[PDB]
Design a protein around this ligand. Structure first.
Ligand SMILES: OC[C@@H](O)[C@@H](O)CO
Lengths: 221, 213
């Protein structure tokens, strides 16, 4: 199994710096070309940088829109590829994917992405409130419950239920930007109404830029 | 640089039908077009390389064709699990470029939403704010109307809605509407109601509660 795992995203002021990392496994790392490809609502999928093998001088190539500001590097002893970003701009905001390109053809493996936000605003961790089940959130044999993840910045937060053991029926809604400048979202799950008060439901909320890791037990009302 | 034009940007098809995605290159790219699938909250997955060679593990209903500047991705019988965005990519010349993507919606029979309402939590109320949430779960088609009434007074400008992307297991959408009030304005009223209209409902559905019950 090939795996690529990015990290290092977060919030940075305009003009600031930030270094992304990616660790690879499942192929002979030092023989292959590692890439960063970013994604944003405005520009879609956009190749950013490539570093090729040590055997051909670890040659680095950059998209014209980041040339001079970004530096890609690799450490073959760690199976790591890095992206040092400087003089960051608002338009650099996006999801940054670590990706392998098969010698100038397909991007045949991708990581899961790490999110970069270039903004003058500050980091704020979320507050987490239960959306408690009751008869008012029961529809026949289905009950709904959830978690309200309120007043955080920047994106993203991840939510899981019962430490990931509960995935069926879960909807985590796209975040909305409130007038305050802070994001807000709800994660809900639908369950059998008979399981209210007999099964435990805990939403696990993670907001890395503020190092919030909160588990919230959601109880019937 | 080579521009890949993917048009149309949205496709909507019924299950069991054949669907075709179009990718046109502004210059000759030979056969060096690659197709990717990106599911909601996921990463692009390689499907076809070099216009028509499907990768190992891709279901056989996927196939590609074309050469020169005109390329097609086909799904000969579409299922809900095929709901995603589809991107093309050229590696004929540097730099490699991607199309803008086409989104695939798979139609289904009309499904009225289940409607649920949640009062604000005691914890949030202690912080001075009351958020009331109305959930419209697993409906189709996407269009739905949500109105907040507080003691039968229609509310305006104090709510926000968020809609999920179409679900690949059952082709439905879900929607949340959050009404936010100060604790002071929350305590000045009693009845908090959520009213939902949708193609699948024979008449509007109202979910409500009395504050403090
Ligand atoms: O999440 C499915 C819900 O409708 C349950 O009643 C079925 O087990």
């Amino acid at each position: 199994e090939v795996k690529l795992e990015e990290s290092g995203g977060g919030l940075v002021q305009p003009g600031g710096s930030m270094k992304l990392s990616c660790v690879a496994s499942g192929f002979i790392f030092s023989n292959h070309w590692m890439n960063w490809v970013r994604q944003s609502p405005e520009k879609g999928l956009e190749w950013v940088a490539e570093i090729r093998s040590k055997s051909i001088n670890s040659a680095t190539h950059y998209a014209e829109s980041v040339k001079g500001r970004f530096t890609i590097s690799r450490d073959d002893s760690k199976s790591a590829v890095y992206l040092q970003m400087t003089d960051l701009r608002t338009e650099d905001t996006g999801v940054y994917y670590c990706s392998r390109n098969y010698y100038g053809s397909t991007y045949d493996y991708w990581g899961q992405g790490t999110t970069l936000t270039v903004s003058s605003a500050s980091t704020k961790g979320p507050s987490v409130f239960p959306l408690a089940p009751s008869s008012k959130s029961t529809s026949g044999g289905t009950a709904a419950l959830g978690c309200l993840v309120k007043d955080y910045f920047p994106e993203p937060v991840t939510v899981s239920w019962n430490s990931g053991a509960l995935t069926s029926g879960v909807h985590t809604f796209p975040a909305v930007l409130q007038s305050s400048g802070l994001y807000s979202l709800s994660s809900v799950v639908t369950v059998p109404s008979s399981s209210l008060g007999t099964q435990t439901y805990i939403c696990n909320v993670n907001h890395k830029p503020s190092n919030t890791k909160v588990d919230k037990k959601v109880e019937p009302k | 640089d080579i521009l890949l034009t993917q048009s149309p940007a949205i496709l909507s098809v019924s299950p069991g039908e054949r669907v075709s995605f179009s990718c046109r290159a502004s210059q000759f790219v030979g056969s060096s077009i690659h197709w990717y699938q990106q599911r909601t909250n996921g990463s692009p997955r390689l499907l076809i390389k070099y216009a028509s060679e499907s990768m190992s593990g891709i279901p056989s209903r996927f196939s590609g064709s074309g050469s020169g500047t005109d390329f097609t991705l086909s799904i000969n019988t579409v299922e809900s699990e095929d709901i995603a965005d589809y991107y093309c990519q050229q590696s004929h010349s540097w730099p490699f470029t991607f199309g803008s993507g086409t989104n695939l919606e798979v139609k289904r029979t009309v499904a009225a939403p289940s409607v649920f309402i949640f009062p604000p939590s005691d914890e949030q109320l202690k912080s001075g704010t009351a958020s009331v949430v109305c959930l419209l779960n697993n409906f189709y088609p996407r269009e739905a109307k949500v109105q907040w009434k507080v003691d039968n007074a229609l509310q305006s400008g104090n709510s926000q809605e968020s809609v999920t992307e179409q679900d690949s297991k059952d082709s439905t959408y879900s929607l949340s509407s959050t009404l936010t009030l100060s604790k002071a304005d929350y305590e000045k009223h009693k009845v908090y109601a959520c009213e939902v209209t949708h193609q699948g409902l024979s008449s509007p559905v109202t979910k409500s509660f009395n504050r403090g019950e």
